[PDB]
Each structure stands twice: as C-alpha cells, then as structure tokens.
Design a protein around this ligand. Structure first.
Ligand SMILES: COc1cc(C[C@H](N)C(=O)O)ccc1O
Ligand SMILES: COc1cc(C[C@H](N)C(=O)O)ccc1O
Lengths: 310, 310
C-alpha cells in the first residue's frame, strides 16, 4: 500500500482525499496537530501521535502545537501551570519516538500581528458558528463566557501561523477545521482520527479516574484498569477493549489461555479476533488479559525512556 | 458653586456622586473619555469635550482615547484609514481649547500584557452581558459576529490601562461602564453626558446628511442645516434647536426680531427662553435664526484655529 492508503488507515475521514493526493506530490510538506496540555497522556493521545508518525514516515515535517493559550481560554487554569504541563507533554511525545518540532501557542499567539489577525477573523465569524464549533470541545456552560468564542478563532489563527498543509485532530475538531477551511487563504487538508472510547464505556477516553490507560502507567495499573473496563461478552460496538485491540496491537498475536476452554489461541488479525469475540468463543476475561499484556509490551519503551530521563 | 456642582452641571448621571466627592479630594486625579474616530466632529462630540474641559478646570489631568482598535472591531473600516481619521480628530479636539493627552487604542492595545488581560476578562464576561452592553453602540446585526463581544472587553481593558479615576461618555456607554465597574480592581467613577438629539429630530446627532452641525461647518452650512431642523412651534421635548440653546449658548442673549411680533427679545437664561417658546411667544423661525448666529460665533474660534493650521 502507498503513502496515501497508509495515512488513510484507521482514520475517520480526510477532507479531502483528492487534496491529500495533491499534497503528497509536493517535495516539502508539513502536518500539525494541537493538544491542550493534559496531566495524563493516554491512548487517546497516542492514537493521534501514531498518525503523526505515519505522516512523518510519508515525508511530512511534523509540528506539534502545545496549545497553552487555547487551554487557558478553555478554562484549564493559569498559564504558568498550563505551560508546566505542556513541558511534560513535550517529553512524553518525544518518548513516543516522534520526530517533531514543538510550538507553544503563546510563542507567537500574543504577538501584535497574530492578535490583529484574531480580531480580523472575529470580524468574519458569527457568534453562532463559533459557538457550534465548540459543542464537542467545551462543557456547555450555564451562561457561556466570551472566551468560548475566542477559542475557535485562536485555533484557526494558529493553523494559519503554523502553516501546515495538513491539520490532524480528533473528530471533535471537525467544526473548527471546517471553519479554518472557510476563513484562511490556504485550505488545510484535515485528517480526523476516531474517538477512542474510555475504559468506563461511557464517552471518550479522558483523565477521569480509571477511564484511561496512560502511556506511562505501571504494569499493575494497566492490568487493574483493563480488568475492570467495560467489556460485555460478544459485544464489539463501544467496547474499549476491542478498540484497543484494533488500534494498538500487533498481529499475528497469541492469546494465552489455560486448558478449560483453551488453550493458546492464535489470532492472525484484528478481524479474526473480532469474529471469535462476537461468537463468544473468546471470553472477555481472556481478551482483557491478552490486551493488558500486549499493552504493557507496547508501552514499555515509552515508560522506560521517560523513567531513564533525569 | 463648587467643583462638584460645576462638574455635575448638564450631566445625565454620575456613578456615583459620593465617589466623585472622594476623587475630588485627591491631589492628582485623571479623567478619560474614548471616541471612535469620526469623519465629522459635531456638537454631540463638543458637548462631551466641554465636560472634559470642566473636569480639567477642576484639576483633572485629561486623557482622550482615540479608539482606533475599538472602531476596527465595530466594523468602521481598515486600521490605516481609521487611524487617519483619528489624527484629524486629535487636531479638532486640540482646536477646541482642550489641554489633554491623546492615546490611540493600538498604542498599547496590541501589547502582550494587554492582550493577555483581554483574554482574562473574556473568561469573566458572559456572552449575554457582552451582547447587552453593545445594544446602544452597534447596529444589531443579522447574525452578530464575535468581534461585537470583543469590543466591550477591549473598552473595559482600555479603561484599566489608561488608569483614570473618572470615565466620561454618553449615556449609551453606561452598560460598558457598569461592566468596567464589575471587572476591574479599581472602580472608575462614571460621568455620563446626555444624548444630543440630531437635527432631523430622529435619534442622536450623527454624521448622516443634514443631521449634525460639525464644529468646523461654514456659516452658510450652519444656517442652512439649522433652518431645516426639526423644530415644531411650542415644542421643547426632543427639539434639537432647544437642546442646542440649552447646552451651548451663553446668556443673557438678545434674539434679533423685526417689528411685526418684534422686536429684539432679551432672554436672561435658557429657562426664560423655554417659557417664551412653550407659550408660542417666540416662533421657531426667530429661535432658529438666533441659534444659528450664536452657534456661528461659538464655533468660530474652532473653525479658524483649524483653518490657520498649514
Ligand atoms: C486553540 O488552540 C488549539 C487547541 C487545540 C486543542 C483542540 N481544540 C482540542 O480541544 O482537542 C489544538 C490546536 C490548537 O491550535
Ligand atoms: C473599545 O474602545 C473604546 C471605544 C469607545 C467608544 C464608545 N464605546 C462609543 O461607541 O461611543 C470609547 C473608549 C474606548 O476605549
């Protein structure tokens, strides 16, 4: 499979594919993704970094925006604190094997020319468009504040200043990205990654207790949290354990099982694993045990790189 | 009458009087007023500059904010053009005898620290409060834009940065000023001037054709526009000619009249003039003629100062 199909793999959508094909033909091309600094870096984050690595292998220069200013506008706390967490996030992304440049929103996002462009875009953006674009991004406040409508314009302006040909993010960014394609002279090609279900089975993976696997979780934590995850027998839809098997695991894979309903089950691919689970041949307990052990191996290099840093 | 009563004269309200009395007791005190640059400087503007002169005579240091950035957010055009009109406004205010310092919103209003404070205030201001505060200031748009809710926060931030003890403006600024008293550590004392009715008798004085007397209008223009102004016999309420007689004219004043229903009418004060007009003893024609001639004399020094500048 060529660069395109590799990039397309495990994405929810590309806006547009035709535009990506044109981007691919360029000698120099860049792709950016922005993250509001987060106290835990979890598989939701890793899934997107994995896509940036794909883009990088396809000859893209990668920029990671550490969106401190954005987090500040999205009520995440004081800049000083947000920036501190941004510093930690940078180390984690680096530990994930990603070769990228890292830019803080505040690096450029408080400059005169940048700010003037925020106001210029604000002249162009309806309150209605701005508010809708934040539906999947903010909490929906009782009486929403002005900061909420400044956020999307600032994200659009960051996309402009970073200058990437491609913008990558989760499906929840799609309204901001579509706004960016209407407001900016250069239409960015948007690559959206699927939303990874939280371990609770209730909404996306997030820093809520027990709801996430952090890339630097210890093995006991990974086992404990995977053990208690939502994972009904025979149920694939909204099953976060199956999603993890789909997006992170390597195949062929052997699932260790004892003798009763055993033994070691060889699975050639995710699709084989899917059939076996839906038919209740593979029970949730064995599935979880194997995903926990594979995840430990998968995440091990990241955790040890981080620990070895003093 | 003391400084307080002089300052209070011809104002619509002071928020609050008790706070003004305290301000007055200070050795050094400042008062600011902001104007979006305007192509014509008219009696609506002059009425407020007259109040700044009063404040100045009472020992206040005066700051005039030329609100270019604000005008830009209020859709008045491009910064370059707005700033050009700002330069002309500065000359007119100077020609009005006012001793003040002049600051453009963009002088400080694009600095990092200033901008960070805009975002900080935006975190504090509901979209609902922001929008209401702009009701008497913006056009009420079909689908309002984000810029409209950035405007009031920027005006509040300017008040903070300029640092005046008093903020002066028209009654239409009252919601922004009240917001400034909630959002800033130092509560500014707000002095609001009445809204001067336009010559058309339909809403405030404004740059619409025939609706204003510009401080630098030639005498023929002043006579023509006063002649066709709204001015029903015996009607004082909403009569822009009576308002002009109230706010700009000097008394005692002699109204020139011919022999039939004559002759020269001596008026000791605005109140005398009011009674005579309501009782239809003074007809609109004689009233307009005298206001036109007095206005020509009143505005003459301003026009000639401006013309003498090359
Ligand atoms: C506003 O700044 C950004 C925010 C984000 C975060 C994203 N909107 C999210 O909440 O997932 C990404 C890139 C940005 O430039
Ligand atoms: C937003 O900037 C300002 C605007 C104005 C203009 C005022 N709001 C008006 O429209 O009359 C005054 C002072 C300011 O600092």
């Amino acid at each position: 499979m060529d660069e395109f199909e590799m990039i397309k793999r495990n994405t929810s959508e590309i806006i547009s594919e035709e535009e990506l094909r044109e981007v691919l033909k360029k000698d120099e091309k860049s792709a950016e993704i922005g993250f509001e600094p987060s106290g835990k870096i979890h598989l939701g984050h890793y899934l997107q970094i994995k896509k940036m690595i794909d883009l990088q292998n396809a000859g893209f220069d990668i920029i990671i925006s550490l969106a401190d200013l954005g987090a500040y506008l999205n009520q995440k706390g004081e800049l000083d604190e947000i920036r501190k967490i941004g510093d930690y996030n940078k180390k984690v992304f680096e530990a994930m094997g990603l070769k990228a440049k890292y830019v803080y929103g505040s690096e450029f996002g408080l400059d005169k020319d940048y700010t003037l462009n925020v106001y210029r875009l604000a002249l162009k953006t309806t309150l209605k468009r701005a508010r809708r674009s934040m539906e999947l991004i903010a909490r929906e406040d009782e009486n929403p504040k002005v900061a909420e409508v400044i956020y999307p314009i600032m994200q659009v302006n960051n996309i402009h200043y970073v200058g990437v040909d491609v913008a990558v993010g989760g499906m929840e960014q799609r309204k901001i990205h579509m706004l960016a394609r209407e407001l900016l002279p250069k239409k960015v090609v948007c690559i959206h990654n699927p939303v990874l279900t939280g371990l609770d089975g209730e909404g996306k993976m997030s820093s809520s207790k027990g709801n996430f696997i952090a890339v630097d979780d210890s093995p006991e934590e990974i086992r404990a949290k995977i053990k208690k995850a939502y994972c009904p027998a025979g149920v694939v839809e909204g099953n976060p354990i199956m999603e993890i098997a789909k997006y992170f695991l390597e195949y062929p894979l052997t699932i260790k099982r004892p003798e009763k309903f055993g033994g070691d089950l060889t699975v050639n691919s995710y699709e084989e694993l899917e059939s076996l689970f839906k038919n209740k041949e593979l029970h949730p307990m064995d599935l979880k045990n194997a995903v926990a052990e594979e995840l430990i191996k998968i995440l091990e290099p990241i955790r040890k790189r981080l620990a070895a840093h003093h």
